Structure 1
Amino acid sequence: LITDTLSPQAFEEALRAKGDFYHIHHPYHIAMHNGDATRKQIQGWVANRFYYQTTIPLKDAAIMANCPDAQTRRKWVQRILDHDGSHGEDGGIEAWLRLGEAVGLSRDDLLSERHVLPGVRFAVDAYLNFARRACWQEAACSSLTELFAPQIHQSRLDSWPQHYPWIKEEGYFYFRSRLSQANRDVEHGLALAKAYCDSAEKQNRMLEILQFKLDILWSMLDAMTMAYALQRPPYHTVTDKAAWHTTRLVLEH
């Protein structure tokens, strides 16, 4: 709990220290990294994360709508170009849709968002809803869990080949595409964070912002655990069909 303002460099080490709570340390992730995860578990994860992926562009749009600095928008929109892809077959979102195929799910399995668990949907929407209401700097800097993302993206490129041979070749792309896209992201991220967070007030609060971002990732996995590892999906005492809501209600009729 910072009393005396930290410096552009001491604050960078408070930020990265929050990587100790990153979702790499979540049993659900730990079981995937070791090969103990089943087919249904890996599928649920890819389909649920696709809600997270198709949201990033929304959220970055929302930041841009809140940010009147032309120069900052000129950078930040590359995050959107990245995920939507310039034209028809490219994208981080296509590439995920591909990673779906490569674990034996259709495109429609994903695009339908039918397998997206409410616990996941709520965690993720809270990211969006934050980006919509907060001042753009804060929403922008909440992206900074991209710091820790390279290491976890590699973590999968290593171990899924050996411990999960059946995962088609061309899905590993996204995780690859990201080893760089996230180091560029963060380079803006950090210059912003380092710059804007120029007092003790703003430092403490941005740390709490980051915890929130971390809480979201953790809760996404928590709903995945309950459903796919523990045989405890929504309404399991009442039925074994999927009964949860499946539509982004406010965005679409």
Structure 2
Amino acid sequence: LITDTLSPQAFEEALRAKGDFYHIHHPYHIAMHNGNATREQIQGWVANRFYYQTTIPLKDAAIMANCPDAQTRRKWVQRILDHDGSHGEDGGIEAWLRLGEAVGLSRDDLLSERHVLPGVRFAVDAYLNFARRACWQEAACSSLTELFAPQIHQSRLDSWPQHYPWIKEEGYFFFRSRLSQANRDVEHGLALAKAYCDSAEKQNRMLEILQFKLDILWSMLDAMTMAYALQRPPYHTVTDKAAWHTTRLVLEHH
């Protein structure tokens, strides 16, 4: 715990040290990186991760709704544009659907969200709900696991083509696009954290918030592990069919 307020440089270093807990260290990621995941494991990952991807613009809109600073909103809205795109096959969500296709899944497989495991849903919804309820600065700074994301994107670009040659090359567009977007994102996110977190109290709080975000990512992979690596998807003792709920109940009727 921080007793005496860290300088902004030292606080940055403390944020960066949290990368030790990033999901690049989860066995699910490591198995994919080393060429040991099966096609079903990769498909399940893409389908489930789509739920996180389609939640990012919701979460960013939530931050904006809580942010009375127009200068910040002018910057933050670019994240929504990056994922939703402007008119057509544009943006990140579309690029993730093309990754779905590149690994053998249809657009409907992803858009229906029917494969999204409840453990994935609850972790991702925790992010959204934090963004809706916390102060905008705290919610904005919980993005800063993006500090670690270019490394993990690059890892996939480096390892997947030779372990999984069946993944269509269009599939890699999204990862490539994030090497630059994540960096532009953190330029702002860091600047904001270093400016906002100017007391030991705020610094310790922010470190716990970043841990929360790390926990969301790890928990998504835990759910995937249980369903696709360990033969223990929900209700496996009672049925061989998917029986979990498949609806964003507070945002859609059905």
TM-score (structure 2 length as normaliser) = 0.99
Q: Deviations over 1:113-158 (max 9, x none)?
A: 0000000000000000000000000000000000000000000000
- Measured after TM superposition, the shift of residue 74 of structure 1 is 0.1
More helix by share: 2
- Per-residue CA deviations over 1:146-178 (Å, capped at 9, x if unaligned) read 000000000000000011110011010000010
Give the C-alpha shift of residue 192 in structure 1: 0.1
Per the alignment, residue 151 of structure 2 pairs with 151
1:89: how far off? 1.3
Instruction: Give, in whole Å, the separation in 2 of the partners of 1:118 and 1:210.
Output: 23
Tell me the SS of whatever aligns to 1:13.
helix
C-alpha displacement of 1:3: 0.4
Deviation at 1:103, TM superposition (A): 0.3
> In the TM superposition, what whole-angstrom CA distance separates every residue of 1:31-67 from its partner, at most 9, and x where no partner exists?
0000000010000000000000000000000000000
1:27 aligned partner: 27
- Equivalent pairs: percent with the same residue? 99
CA RMSD of aligned residues (A): 0.4
Cα distance between partner residues in 2 of 1:16 and 1:248: 33
Q: Verify: 1:109 aligned to 2:109, yes or no.
A: yes
- Rounded to whole Å, the distance in 1 between the matches of 2:73 and 2:171 is 31
> Is the partner of 1:9 in helix, strand or coil?
helix
Deviations 1:66-112 (A, max 9, x none): 00000000000000000000112101000000000000000000000
What is the aligned partner in structure 1 of residue 64 from structure 2?
64
Deviation at 1:182, TM superposition (A): 0.2
Q: Once the two structures are superposed, what CA deviation does each residue of 1:232-251 show, in whole Å capped at 9, x if it has no partner? A: 00000000100000000000
1:192 aligns with 2:192: yes
Return the alpha-carbon distance in structure 2 between the equivalents of residues 4 and 87 of structure 1.
50
Q: Distance in 2 between matches of 1:225 and 1:18?
A: 23
| C-alpha displacement of 1:210 | 0.2
Shift of 1:25: 0.3
The DSSP-based 3-state class of the residue aligned with 2:178 is: helix
Distance 2:240 2:153 in 1: 33
Gaps (5+ residues) in structure 1? none
Question: How far apart are 1:181 and its partner, in Å?
Answer: 0.2
CA distance in 2, matches of 1:211, 1:222: 16
Q: Which aligned segments of 4 or more residues in structure 1 are displaced greater than 6 angstroms?
A: none
CA distance in 2, matches of 1:107, 1:164: 21
- For 1:183-212, what per-residue CA distance to the aligned partner results, in whole angstroms no more than 9, with x for missing partners? 000000000000000000000000000000
SS in 1 for 2:5: coil
Structure 2 unaligned spans of 5+: none
